[PDB]
Amino acid sequence: PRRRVIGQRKILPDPKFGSELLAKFVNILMVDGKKSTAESIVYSALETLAQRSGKSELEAFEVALENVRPTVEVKSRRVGGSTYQVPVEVRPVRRNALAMRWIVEAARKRGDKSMALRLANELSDAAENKGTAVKKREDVHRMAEANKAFA
Amino acid sequence: QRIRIRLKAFDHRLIDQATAEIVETAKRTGAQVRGPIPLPTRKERFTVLISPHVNKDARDQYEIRTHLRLVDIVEPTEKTVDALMRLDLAAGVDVQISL
Amino acid sequence: RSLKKGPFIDLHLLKKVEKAVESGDKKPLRTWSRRSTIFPNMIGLTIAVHNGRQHVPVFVTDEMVGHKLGEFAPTRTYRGHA
Amino acid sequence: ARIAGINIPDHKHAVIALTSIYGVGKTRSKAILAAAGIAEDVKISELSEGQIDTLRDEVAKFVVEGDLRREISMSIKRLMDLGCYRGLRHRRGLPVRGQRTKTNARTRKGPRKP
Amino acid sequence: NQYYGTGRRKSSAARVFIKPGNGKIVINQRSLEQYFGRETARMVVRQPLELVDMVEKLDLYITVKGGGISGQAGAIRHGITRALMEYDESLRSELRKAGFVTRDARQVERKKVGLRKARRRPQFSKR
Amino acid sequence: AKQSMKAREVKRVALADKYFAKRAELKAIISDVNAASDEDRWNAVLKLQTLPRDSSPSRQRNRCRQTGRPHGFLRKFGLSRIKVREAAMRGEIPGLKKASW
RNA sequence: GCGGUCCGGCCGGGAACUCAAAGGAGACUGCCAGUGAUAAACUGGAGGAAGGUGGGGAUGACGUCAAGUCAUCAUGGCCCUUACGACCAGGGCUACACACGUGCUACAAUGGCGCAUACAAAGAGAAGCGACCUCGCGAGAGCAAGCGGACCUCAUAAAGUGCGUCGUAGUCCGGAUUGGAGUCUGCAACUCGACUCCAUGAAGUCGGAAUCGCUAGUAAUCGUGGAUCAGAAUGCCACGGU
Ligand SMILES: CN(CC(=O)O)NC(=O)C[C@H](N)C[C@@H](O)CNCCCN
Numbered sequence A: 001p002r003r004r005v006i007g008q009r010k011i012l013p014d015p016k017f018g019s020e021l022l023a024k025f026v027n028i029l030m031v032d033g034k035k036s037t038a039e040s041i042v043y044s045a046l047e048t049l050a051q052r053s054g055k056s057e058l059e060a061f062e063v064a065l066e067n068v069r070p071t072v073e074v075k076s077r078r079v080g081g082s083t084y085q086v087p088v089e090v091r092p093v094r095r096n097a098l099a100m101r102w103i104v105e106a107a108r109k110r111g112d113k114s115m116a117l118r119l120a121n122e123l124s125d126a127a128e129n130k131g132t133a134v135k136k137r138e139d140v141h142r143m144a145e146a147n148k149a150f151a
Numbered sequence B: 001q002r003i004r005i006r007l008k009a010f011d012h013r014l015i016d017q018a019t020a021e022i023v024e025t026a027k028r029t030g031a032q033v034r035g036p037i038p039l040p041t042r043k044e045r046f047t048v049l050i051s052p053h054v055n056k057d058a059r060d061q062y063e064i065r066t067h068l069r070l071v072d073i074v075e076p077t078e079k080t081v082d083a084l085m086r087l088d089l090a091a092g093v094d095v096q097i098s099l
Numbered sequence C: 001r002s003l004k005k006g007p008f009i010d011l012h013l014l015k016k017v018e019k020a021v022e023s024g025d026k027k028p029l030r031t032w033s034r035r036s037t038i039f040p041n042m043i044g045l046t047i048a049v050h051n052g053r054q055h056v057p058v059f060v061t062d063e064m065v066g067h068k069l070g071e072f073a074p075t076r077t078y079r080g081h082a
Numbered sequence D: 001a002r003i004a005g006i007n008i009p010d011h012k013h014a015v016i017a018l019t020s021i022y023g024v025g026k027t028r029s030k031a032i033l034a035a036a037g038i039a040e041d042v043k044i045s046e047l048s049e050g051q052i053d054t055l056r057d058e059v060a061k062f063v064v065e066g067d068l069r070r071e072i073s074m075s076i077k078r079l080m081d082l083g084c085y086r087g088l089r090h091r092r093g094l095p096v097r098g099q100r101t102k103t104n105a106r107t108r109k110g111p112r113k114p
Numbered sequence E: 001n002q003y004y005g006t007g008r009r010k011s012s013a014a015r016v017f018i019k020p021g022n023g024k025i026v027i028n029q030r031s032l033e034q035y036f037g038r039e040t041a042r043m044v045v046r047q048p049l050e051l052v053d054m055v056e057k058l059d060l061y062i063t064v065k066g067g068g069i070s071g072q073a074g075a076i077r078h079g080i081t082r083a084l085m086e087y088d089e090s091l092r093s094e095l096r097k098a099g100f101v102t103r104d105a106r107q108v109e110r111k112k113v114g115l116r117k118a119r120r121r122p123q124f125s126k127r
Numbered sequence F: 001a002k003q004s005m006k007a008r009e010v011k012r013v014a015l016a017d018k019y020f021a022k023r024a025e026l027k028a029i030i031s032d033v034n035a036a037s038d039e040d041r042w043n044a045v046l047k048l049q050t051l052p053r054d055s056s057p058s059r060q061r062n063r064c065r066q067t068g069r070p071h072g073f074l075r076k077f078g079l080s081r082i083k084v085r086e087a088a089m090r091g092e093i094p095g096l097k098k099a100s101w
Numbered sequence G: 001g002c003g004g005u006c007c008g009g010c011c012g013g014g015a016a017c018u019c020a021a022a023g024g025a026g027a028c029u030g031c032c033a034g035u036g037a038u039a040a041a042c043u044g045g046a047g048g049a050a051g052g053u054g055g056g057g058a059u060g061a062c063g064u065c066a067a068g069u070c071a072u073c074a075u076g077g078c079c080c081u082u083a084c085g086a087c088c089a090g091g092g093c094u095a096c097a098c099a100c101g102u103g104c105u106a107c108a109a110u111g112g113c114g115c116a117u118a119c120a121a122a123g124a125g126a127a128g129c130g131a132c133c134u135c136g137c138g139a140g141a142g143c144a145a146g147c148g149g150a151c152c153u154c155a156u157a158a159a160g161u162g163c164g165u166c167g168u169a170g171u172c173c174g175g176a177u178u179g180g181a182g183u184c185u186g187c188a189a190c191u192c193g194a195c196u197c198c199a200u201g202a203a204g205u206c207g208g209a210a211u212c213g214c215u216a217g218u219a220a221u222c223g224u225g226g227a228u229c230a231g232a233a234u235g236c237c238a239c240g241g242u
């Protein structure tokens, strides 16, 4: 915006754990205001991370979030009729926002039966640094140090 | 037996002086009164096109409010019944009596 | 689909048919009543039905019974675009 | 394995696979099975010859197969011979029940020709 | 004695009676697991008695009316704080920082003429 | 709105209360099933058609009372949408002020 | 809060509470720090339900486009007058190689179907809304009390929650199209109504170039009501849930 610059809006924690990053993850998954159905997918997918591949439930989600986080991104900066792709440092609240969207959008284009199982395998693939959410992260970092000369 | 009187009007200042005159007047000749009761206000709404020819999205919205007050008298003495009939209040106030 | 308590026919068509049946047929019978039901009593008759400008002669076959008279006179002139 | 309907239904549930018979929808398939005393969560594998043959008798009561295709084509041929309004809409591929033909007659008219 | 509070949310209204000593939550003559099927709604009625430790220390008698599931649960949480502030008078600044004293005044915006919704505009075309 | 169109409305309403709201017995309970289910009902379905083509309450258009407009009618006032605004701003419809909620 | 109960606010009763609608208070940069030219004003803090025009509405300056409307009405000029006026039946405005705009429903598993069970607001009703009961698979029919209404009726909110099934298929996805049998309104349902039942089961598997809306109780999604109206909304005007 030009003039009315904004404070922030508040998110509630999660009920089971008390985390708002986890609650931001349910918001990003939610479609058409169906919040109860998004928690059902998110809760069922996270314990089916736990005893299928490794314990400490919510520690395992943060560590899967550690790998898909970007640090640089590209952004276009216009001069007089020429737009360079300039590599930018991404901010820590934008780091989690891009990482959770890429996880959710990785899980939608899969071949598993349910959404709670597609979520569980993409979070498992992120823990092994594989899949498509990691390669969405790799292409962003490849383009950023490709355009290093336009800094 | 309580005689029950409902008053209807489009104005709330006109209706309150119609209540005040019948609240005045049953107590004039010594009756139990509960007093006035506000019944819920009915709002009718209307939405008209204001152009003579096209322009669907240009409109005006009007409404009519109907204000309600209820007072019951359960001392109907016979000094009351015709003394309640001899009373001259306003032309905007509809009175309807009913047992 | 009119309800089952009474099929519909005009009076002037109902009476003009019944006189025309007990005399042998005729001219084609002029009527404007496109909305009247064809009855069993009218098999064999020729009825000229209005379509807006003309009266289309309809010879009543047995299988036309139960339909309306306006189904056998097309009200719209159409033959191709190009 | 097969019905009086010469079709071959496959291994779904029985109330769903009886709708593979042309002329049998959802409430005939529930009425067929309700009269045979067969539950509907049962497939057709699992289901005896003494239960396939008993399914054939009550289905053999409705007018369900190529006998119905004749009666349906009978009644279209009917309207196409009277020259009524419904018959001229049938010989022209145009919608019959009074829908719009200025736009959106595309199922009855097929894909568009310029 | 009872300490009463009135809380309200979107179109809901909740009446709240608290009596000293139990961990009983009764709402519309139902218990909490039977009334609120949603565990988020279960966890927002427990918020003001989890900040202030009167969990097995204060009974609560609740009625609600109007609105829906999340609207009624938010009206209760606002109504419990008003009851607990009549009880002590010094749990106030504890609760103001939790944001439980502010009546959330966000209502549904009316549908406007010419618009498909309160703010959604029909689809524009240049020609 | 073309003076003769105003006269069609006032003839239709006089011929409907001439016959109907009294001569509805032919369809009111002659066309429902009891002992009258014989040819007497069939005589009714034919006798109901020789009353004039008007006379029915479903041929009244309900026009505006001042201009005679066939569209934009409001049963509460008896006027068209133009005449209710023209007459509401002068303060002549009682209690009808501009709504703002 | 009490007494009783059929455990139904149900009955006495209470005027507390929700609520109804009249009146009053409250928000004013009022208080405080800092910055600014002894300014205005700005950033921040306290209190407070609310804080910087708190949210939304009505309110459209002088004028612009010879913008729209002689067809709502009014009106100058012109023109018709045994007709360009008046009455009637039937037809048409619903045509159909095609092109465009605005919508609705979909292409499914964040789902379909089946059983059970919660939580709304706001509106309308007398040549009308129409309970109970009986008949009908159903649309509905018979009988028929209450209500000119915080009382009676329309009127069973749906998304949601619990259990089961379907297991990624042109599918138990989709419901277009057509055949047969009906109901209701109405002189009349052929052209040309809505709805119900049985059968049929098309295209469609996320859409090229292009292009639209939205900054918070908003977008998205889900039901309800009203006007017009004998009957006939996916439109329009309103209301709430997530
Ligand atoms: C109906 N849904 C289907 C879906 O979910 O994909 N959405 C669409 O059709 C729009 C599509 N997603 C993106 C489009 O507007 C922007 N792309 C521009 C193309 C070149 N101008």
Ligand SMILES: [Mg+2]
Pocket: D018, D019, D020, D021, D022, D023, D024, D025
């Ligand atoms: Mg079949």
Ligand SMILES: [Mg+2]
Pocket: D098, D099
């Ligand atoms: Mg149509």
Ligand SMILES: [Mg+2]
Pocket: E108
């Ligand atoms: Mg809404």
Ligand SMILES: [Mg+2]
Pocket: B056, E122
């Ligand atoms: Mg529009």
Ligand SMILES: [Mg+2]
Pocket: F001, F002, F003
């Ligand atoms: Mg005139």
Ligand SMILES: [Mg+2]
Pocket: F058, F059, F060, F061
């Ligand atoms: Mg009419």
Ligand SMILES: [Mg+2]
Pocket: none
């Ligand atoms: Mg006040």
Ligand SMILES: [Mg+2]
Pocket: G051
């Ligand atoms: Mg402050």
Ligand SMILES: [Mg+2]
Pocket: none
């Ligand atoms: Mg003429």
Ligand SMILES: [Mg+2]
Pocket: none
């Ligand atoms: Mg038109």
Ligand SMILES: [Mg+2]
Pocket: D098, D099, D100, D101, G094
């Ligand atoms: Mg058509």
Ligand SMILES: [Mg+2]
Pocket: none
């Ligand atoms: Mg399921």
Ligand SMILES: [Mg+2]
Pocket: G168
């Ligand atoms: Mg698929």
Ligand SMILES: [Mg+2]
Pocket: none
């Ligand atoms: Mg295909």
Ligand SMILES: [Mg+2]
Pocket: G172
């Ligand atoms: Mg289906």
Ligand SMILES: [Mg+2]
Pocket: none
């Ligand atoms: Mg199918």
